[PDB]
Symmetry: D2
Subunit: 462 residues, 4 copies
Amino acid sequence: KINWEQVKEWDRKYLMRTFSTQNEYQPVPIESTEGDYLITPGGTRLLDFFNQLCCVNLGQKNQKVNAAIKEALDRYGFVWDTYATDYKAKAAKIIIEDILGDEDWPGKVRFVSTGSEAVETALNIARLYTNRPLVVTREHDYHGWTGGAATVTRLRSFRSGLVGENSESFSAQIPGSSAVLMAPSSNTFQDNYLKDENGELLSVKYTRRMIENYGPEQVAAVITEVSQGVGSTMPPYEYVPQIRKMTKELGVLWISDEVLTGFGRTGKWFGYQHYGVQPDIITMGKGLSSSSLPAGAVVVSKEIAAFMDKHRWESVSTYAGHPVAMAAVCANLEVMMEENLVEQAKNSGEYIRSKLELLQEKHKSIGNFDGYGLLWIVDIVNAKTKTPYVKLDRNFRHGMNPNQIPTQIIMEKALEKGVLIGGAMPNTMRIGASLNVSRGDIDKAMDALDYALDYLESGEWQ
Amino acid sequence: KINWEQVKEWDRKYLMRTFSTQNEYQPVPIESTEGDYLITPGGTRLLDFFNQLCCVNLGQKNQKVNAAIKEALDRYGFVWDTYATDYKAKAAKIIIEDILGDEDWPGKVRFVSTGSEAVETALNIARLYTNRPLVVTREHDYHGWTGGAATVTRLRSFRSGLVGENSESFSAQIPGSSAVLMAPSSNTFYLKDENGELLSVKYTRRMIENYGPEQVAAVITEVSQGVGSTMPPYEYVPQIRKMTKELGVLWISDEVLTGFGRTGKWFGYQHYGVQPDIITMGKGLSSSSLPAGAVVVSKEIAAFMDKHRWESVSTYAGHPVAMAAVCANLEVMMEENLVEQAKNSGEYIRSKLELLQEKHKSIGNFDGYGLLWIVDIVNAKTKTPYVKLDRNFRHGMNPNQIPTQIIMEKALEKGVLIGGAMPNTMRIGASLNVSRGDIDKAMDALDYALDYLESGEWQ
Amino acid sequence: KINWEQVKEWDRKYLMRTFSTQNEYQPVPIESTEGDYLITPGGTRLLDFFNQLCCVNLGQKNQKVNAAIKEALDRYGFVWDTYATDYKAKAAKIIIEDILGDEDWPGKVRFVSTGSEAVETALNIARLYTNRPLVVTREHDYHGWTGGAATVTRLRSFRSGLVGENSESFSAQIPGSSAVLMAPSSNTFQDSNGNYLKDENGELLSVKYTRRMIENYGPEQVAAVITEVSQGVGSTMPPYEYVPQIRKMTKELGVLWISDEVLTGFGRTGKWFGYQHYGVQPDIITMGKGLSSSSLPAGAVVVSKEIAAFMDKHRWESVSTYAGHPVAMAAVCANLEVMMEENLVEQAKNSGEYIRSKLELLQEKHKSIGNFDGYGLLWIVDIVNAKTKTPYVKLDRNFRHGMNPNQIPTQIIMEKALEKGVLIGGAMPNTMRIGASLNVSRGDIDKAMDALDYALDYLESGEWQ
Amino acid sequence: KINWEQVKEWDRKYLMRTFSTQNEYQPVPIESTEGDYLITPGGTRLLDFFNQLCCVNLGQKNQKVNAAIKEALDRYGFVWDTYATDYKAKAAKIIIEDILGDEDWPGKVRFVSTGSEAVETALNIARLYTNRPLVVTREHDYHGWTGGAATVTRLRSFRSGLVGENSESFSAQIPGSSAVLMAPSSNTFQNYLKDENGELLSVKYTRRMIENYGPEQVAAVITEVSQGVGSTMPPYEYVPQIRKMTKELGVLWISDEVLTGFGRTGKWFGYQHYGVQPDIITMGKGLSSSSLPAGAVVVSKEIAAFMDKHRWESVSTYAGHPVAMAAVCANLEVMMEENLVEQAKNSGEYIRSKLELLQEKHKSIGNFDGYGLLWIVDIVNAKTKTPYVKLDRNFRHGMNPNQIPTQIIMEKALEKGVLIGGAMPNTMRIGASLNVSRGDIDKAMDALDYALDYLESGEWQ
Ligand SMILES: Cc1ncc(COP(=O)(O)O)c(CN[C@@H](C)C(=O)O)c1O
Ligand SMILES: Cc1ncc(COP(=O)(O)O)c(CN[C@@H](C)C(=O)O)c1O
Ligand SMILES: Cc1ncc(COP(=O)(O)O)c(CN[C@@H](C)C(=O)O)c1O
Ligand SMILES: Cc1ncc(COP(=O)(O)O)c(CN[C@@H](C)C(=O)O)c1O
């Protein structure tokens, strides 16, 4: 017997709040999950189209994955990275030989526990490989929350600072918070994205002038999200190819931060593979294990691997490569390959596109949408004016009243229909589900969006 | 059927090395673990007196922990911090109400995944609460490897930099590795004030005063230095808590290593009659069964954070299956009284170490509590350490010149794993429930290893 | 009777080089100066159309300025800024009531010794006033060489690093070199034909991106934007609407505007200060060069009444030994008293108009002159390959000094002009930075332009290759 | 005919305040200066035992230095650093061959306008030469107010921050105020504690700090041989041990001689009391005896050679200012010719003995030390034998000056005609011209005697 009133009391009383003050907070307990659904203590089933944080690629509580964890618990236990296990070595091989086997740039994997720890590892390797201090990031990027990963995060609403409750008054960012350069977002400069008559996007051209103003000899790496997860954008098609050609011409590394866009999320194994370019470093988390257990990774190129191999690297993480986490990655990745979830995700994206077309023609509050596989960004506008309700947009902070935030009104409304859908940004949806989400579930979720958008466009909420 | 020949191949070929070059590296496979033992694929049983990284407090592969986990897998799944679950809520309650119940300073918990992450969170909170930029650390502290945690880590041999193979020439720290003051180690100077204050504390005070207390958020300590391998003078901890209070600065006690029974008490600081403002946790929190880390803050600090919206997310923070593993691990320590058992075993080790120091002039000094012991190693004839740079070394030097490496190699001939990170200093640990027989086996193997050290044949 | 050969040995032997290796170094001694001329020990008279560093506004060795200095020496000696003197008090008053008397935003002045120290001061003041850490600068700005001033300098060719002798393998910046944001230059985001791009709302994309940058970090994090009205060392002229758009953007974002007026200040641009061409007023001005026309070392910062009242409420724990030096102050008094009464600002205006019509003619004649713009005694000329119509030096303002001077058009031009006894050129590889005294003659202008003609002839024969 | 009533109004109204709020401030004008005297508008003669800022070594308005300037003004005008002048060349030559001519380490000079600009330069050169980022400084050092020079200043009362007026409420340092490590002050750990090997614990801890970071990370240690603003004297072994330590660690030593340079201490330079030689010297103050603003840096032959192989991309407009250099030459030619260093040693040995007597006569002098025309005097409470102002060199100017012993001595001294006192609250920093007369030294020393009389009676409380 679980006493759920008591669980809520303890949860109020003994856990530090994130995003809500204690005063406004209402615990939302989840007793179990499976597939694309969350089950409340009462037995209510909630369709999860945030997919938590787009990190449960394979589906909640996969039967093969759980079984593989249970088998792994017959042997382990725990050993640190200095010891070898079948699970750690198999997971590395699966990534290099099976998943990325058709590309010849990958050299080696390091496993860690979180996407943040992943981005920390890759910034560290990039600076050591080039012997250079500076790393370029882009406006609105999110690469993590930990010190180093946070320095390349350029959302002021996600930097572990503090805001007040429906107020501008009580805000601070963490005091003292660098060896980092902010380049233009892929979505900056558009009136249709502006180019320079050689065809280079103005976001890329001024990224190049920045790197040249500092000196390419000072700059280790450019770190990108192919599509911004928390920041919620899709790039112009030429953007990724152009950042790759630029970085190569400048002798600078390219790190694709694949924590969110990795493992089938975009109808391909990785976000980058949509554009015909290969990176120098990849960071991983989320879909790596489909959140069955905490895991993160970085893959480096042969050349970087060869350089690192020549020295003793004085770096230790206690839980890096934890064998039970690794067995989980093995099973997750094995299910993905044998069940063709990358293709399944691809086909389901195409079904989503066409629902999104139908909704756009019905709802003038949908300013625009794009995405692929199971990653969709939907831009919301005021239907009469065609412009964003919330002026600061991706530069907002959480100090504002949630019932003025369009993605919040939508989420509240969708909920009347057992569906969870919304976004991190105020004017933008970030829709994700499992790669194997069923058609009836997309149908239910799109219908709930339809019902919410009605309410939004009606104005009864102002 | 596991092909271990292959596994080592895949291990050589596709995983990045740490602490070894590719050319020197040889895979050391471990097929399974049980208790205080590790088992090789061929079936050699290795007695683990590292306790990996002093982080398997419960014993390896606890059947009750493993069953509690298997159970949580019937329901889960994954929900991020925004969702409440029984395991996350129970876990916080056990720490606040159950483990820390007789202390009234603690307020709330945040769960994260690793000790480094816990340290990041503590740094953030401290700076946020005080509205101040600077954090004080001490020489030879280890607080983790990620960005923020690294800045307060003062071991040049564990900052994720690069060294060569048996060579002084291929060295580098990470380019651009800043809101952080390094104070002296407790093990410095034992000289005092005549108003009785240790000089190390006095100068730490004088530091905070030179920048100005209004600039300084927090002093972060390890009660006993873990990777750095020290024990303090008894007076160090209370005089820090007092100095920080007087100047209105926070004290974070970094209990990632010393926490959950390691020292014969629930926490390292509990040996010293003081309460911290903030504590960081990992390792023994889940006994490494699954990746978990935590921060406990005071009622004062928690109340303050509670008035604000905190714009921080970590995907895996509060992972319900990790939290189920924490619940069980903690429930086992409480019901088996293992903190008590750690204290009692610690006293047996003290007396065993005495017979060693008596039998071996290369043991310069030792000290510890529960299942954490630092043994200082010296040249039996000169009575000084073998490796001159001591805790300021880097891993560029040849391991056949590092006493603690020589000790491990020899100890291994007895099937025992014992040694340390530091070149002249041992860090000995085992499970809270290590039996008298295993302690005996490890100390015997230590005997044999120091026998080899003192003969100087390794030169 | 000076031994100038020994002066040459000693200069070679005991002075640290700047911009040259010891081996390539050939000292150029100057025995004296007068007006717009430099005079060698042997008696070569060199027409100085660099005006040294756009810093000798009044002219070299003005007799009244030097006589005022000589007079000051019957009294001083030295006192530090804790004592008041007539000279310091007059200087501040001339700046506030007389020069800036038509504008009502100005509050107080603090004097220092250099333009760098002036920028340091301003940066300190803005951050204290706002209680915010970040300062926004621009691409290719130069704001000085000292610690803080350097951080807002975005020229990798002038951040006090080291390059090689016709090589970039020796090449290093100062290790370490930080609460600064780099905004796009006024001159970034122009098409292949030179039009600056605009919002369709009319806002220059450069300003639009600057705003976006500020809102990304949060305006509560940002103290000030520091600008040059006209980039001096970087050698640019803005679109007319840039200066007004930045003032309006800073106002809206609650951020300060610092006009770095060290080079463009005091007549340089045919008005008292650069910003007065643009119908806006800054929060803080930094000053130097033309403040004393280099007669003695002198820097300054002017701050608004609001900033002044706030700083007045507090004890400021800042000391600089030489700040306010009475003899340097007396030099500013005389310098400024001459500029006012000889109408040198109005004079500067009129000369520039004449220069414009000279360079118009030089452009019609020389296809290597891609473009030019300036005002008063500050002019920029972009140089191109007459044939390809692009600049010869592809890295442009992101170059460093490791490259071979005989491939730098601005070096070749300078060489050739020296054949006509004329000193002219630029710090940037593709762009000339022309300045003389505010009172230069028509003939000395004609003499400079003719040499530029001659130089451009040689540039176009390509024989320098 | 100057209207000094107008000079005051304009001074109050148009000058930014330092150290004083607009409300409390009252202008102290100085109409002329001569030798060791300052002259007010009304004709009052103030004997200056601060020597302004220990920066007018030669004496105020030296008639020879002043005439040299006038001569230079017959020819200049202004040239920047790329053009060679007789004055700039002679000044560097005087410094290297005549002044430092008995030590064979000094290589090249760069002239700048201020002491801070001189420190900036040194830091830049040290980091470039070693290709290392970190500079070690010491608790209570003062090395300037400009960006880089401020990073190595460790006195919170001099970091260009703001405090309130008799109040703890309105204080702030600059947002942003970093590649610098602060090592213990020479005067930390006191008899100063030593190593079992004789090494001072302050030096021992500096070494372990550099070793903790890695000597391969550390460009240089910058010191004041004797702390100026900070107001201290080192134990005799400190300077030699820091010199030995830096060499042992492959690390540069910057002697900041901005204050202690050019005779101040009864030798040419502060370090020269100690039998060692720095890798770099920074200079200001005594360089021109403040006749016109100058600063300079002197580097070793090794450092010079490395610099000479490169094009250095550094420009300072007034660096090398030709009139500033003619001021410098004449200043140095007078110092060498009047044997000012030797004169200074001698007046130092006279002052030592005057202070001794003052110490016998006054229990509030806890301690004194110095040399030449630089003397530090530790002011203590006669009853407890401890300092009046507990935060001592870690204070800030937010406190009421009527409670600062150095403010009290000052105002009572001003009653006898003599400006004497110091920057630190419990420490006097006494300086005069190198050619200060015996009569003036006697007069100042009486004035201190009179002042300490008032301090010790405690009517000020
Ligand atoms: C691209 C990217 N990199 C790195 C991270 C950090 O990974 P961890 O959360 O495992 O530390 C995230 C997390 N995102 C979450 C916050 C999201 O999608 O809302 C991410 O999307
Ligand atoms: C006191 C302390 N804090 C923080 C950490 C870092 O925690 P994670 O490894 O979970 O990030 C450690 C780890 N130490 C390890 C390296 C050891 O004991 O060898 C530690 O001892
Ligand atoms: C806009 C601007 N700000 C600040 C400075 C720094 O002033 P000082 O050099 O006096 O410290 C300069 C100088 N420039 C010079 C060097 C030039 O035009 O070459 C400048 O042009
Ligand atoms: C040792 C030292 N270095 C560097 C400086 C900076 O020089 P400038 O003030 O010219 O920039 C000083 C000045 N000090 C003054 C403030 C004093 O004696 O109190 C100094 O004493």
